[PDB]
């Protein structure tokens, strides 16, 4: 099981170094790049013990891979908007035990980081469906991607829809996270969305309540 420390915002022409830590093994690694709404692309291969590093045709002058023995490192340079993408490190053992990291988003923009505002999408029950009632959180006006929403600190997951973020004409992002819930349970039980925007060091716990 391997995690990679991501969420990078850099200006067109800068350079980044992404980490990739390992919590089980370290032999055999591979890097890949996924444009935000596109197929996968292969970066390259690194031998943990000996820096024997093949690279793709377009990442030759861009990508550089290292390892410290228990992490891997990928350094990119001369980043344009076409490098804004998710970066995965995977260590396949040749047989049937391929592992992958959760990915690292690299946004290439001049825009400033902005923390999100978190507003309730309050249910009514009186003015809602009969069986279930929907409530939610609006996470508005943040940059860069991504934000993460949980409900009741990960305890509530059934019938949660966290939507994809949309980029507004203002150049800022905004997503909604809704959850449906039996209307009987309202008022008695507590519903709280946990918004986390790492690039701006913003964590918000917003208690969503019926309108009073």
């Amino acid at each position: 099981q391997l995690l990679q420390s991501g969420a990078e915002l850099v200006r067109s022409g800068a350079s980044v170094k992404l980490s990739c830590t390992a919590s089980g093994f370290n032999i055999e690694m591979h890097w890949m790049k996924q444009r935000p709404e596109q197929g996968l692309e292969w970066i390259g291969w690194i031998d943990p013990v000996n820096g024997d590093t093949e690279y793709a045709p377009k990442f030759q002058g861009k990508a550089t891979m290292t390892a410290d023995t228990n992490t891997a490192y990928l350094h990119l340079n001369s980043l344009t908007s076409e490098d804004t993408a998710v970066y995965y490190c995977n260590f396949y053992d040749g047989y049937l035990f391929a592992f992958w990291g959760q990915g690292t988003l690299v946004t290439v923009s001049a825009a400033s980081t902005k923390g999100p505002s978190v507003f309730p999408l309050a249910p009514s029950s009186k003015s809602t469906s009969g069986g279930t009632a929907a409530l939610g959180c609006l996470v508005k006006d943040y940059f860069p991607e991504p934000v993460t929403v949980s409900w009741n600190s990960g305890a509530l997951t059934s019938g949660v829809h966290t939507f994809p973020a949309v980029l507004q004409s203002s150049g800022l992002y905004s997503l909604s996270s809704v959850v449906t819930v039996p209307s009987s349970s309202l008022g008695t039980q507590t519903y709280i969305c946990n918004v986390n925007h790492k690039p701006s060091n913003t964590k918000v716990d917003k208690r969503v309540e019926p309108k009073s």
Binding site: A56, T132, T180
Partner: protein, 218 residues
């Protein structure tokens, strides 16, 4: 480099039934040591990819029998039998032959299910947001099938355009339905200039179009 071709979109399948995805290639696909290094991977929505089959036809850890890979020469096929609703995702083919390792354009697998009418909800702007200069009004269309749905914002019975933005979830892994949210953004003043805010939804699963609405101040 070698060009891999998936060339297959939806054509939605029913759970229980089977389906196959193709991968068209240009090269021999045979390492002079016995093996063929075509690999099939699944990427579930909002997740890192995972290994399905490694040597054209061998099964990785965990992948059940119903998955079988096999092709003819350079045209490879992944067959998924006993389709589950949780098989939604994008299926990519890659190869470990020519050193520039290339994926294909992937294939999005959409699962068929019974027509489901969306449950519609409308959310007025929070007072806190109204403290600032903007008012956001949210409309939720929950758990419908199929994908094609229609909605219209209506402020005091007047159509809106230009001022709305929509997001759509992926097909659910469990009930294989879609959800959709639309946000209508107005200045506080313009918001306070009207009474009835309404979202009107039209879907195959509805008898007549449904209209959810609220009135400023309740």
């Amino acid at each position: 480099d070698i060009v891999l071709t998936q060339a297959a979109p939806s054509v939605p399948v029913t759970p229980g039934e089977s389906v196959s995805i193709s991968c068209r290639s240009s090269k021999s696909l045979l390492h002079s040591d016995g093996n063929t290094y075509l690999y099939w991977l699944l990427q579930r929505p909002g997740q890192s990819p995972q290994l399905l089959i490694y040597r054209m036809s061998n099964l990785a850890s965990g992948v059940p029998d119903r998955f079988s890979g096999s092709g003819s020469g350079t045209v490879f096929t992944l067959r998924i039998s006993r389709l589950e609703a949780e098989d939604v995702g994008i299926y990519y083919c890659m190869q470990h032959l020519e050193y520039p390792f290339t994926f294909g354009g992937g294939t999005k697998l959409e699962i068929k299910r019974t027509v489901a009418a969306p449950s519609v909800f409308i959310f007025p702007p929070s007072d806190e947001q109204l403290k600032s200069g903007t008012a956001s009004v949210v409309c939720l269309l929950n758990n419908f099938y199929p994908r094609e749905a229609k909605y219209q914002w209506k402020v005091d019975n007047a159509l809106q355009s230009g001022n709305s933005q929509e997001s759509v979830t992926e097909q659910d892994s469990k009930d294989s339905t879609y959800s959709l949210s639309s946000t209508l953004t107005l200045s506080k003043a313009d918001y306070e200039k009207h009474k009835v805010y309404a979202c009107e939804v039209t879907h195959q699963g509805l008898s007549s179009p449904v209209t959810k609405s609220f009135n400023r101040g309740e």
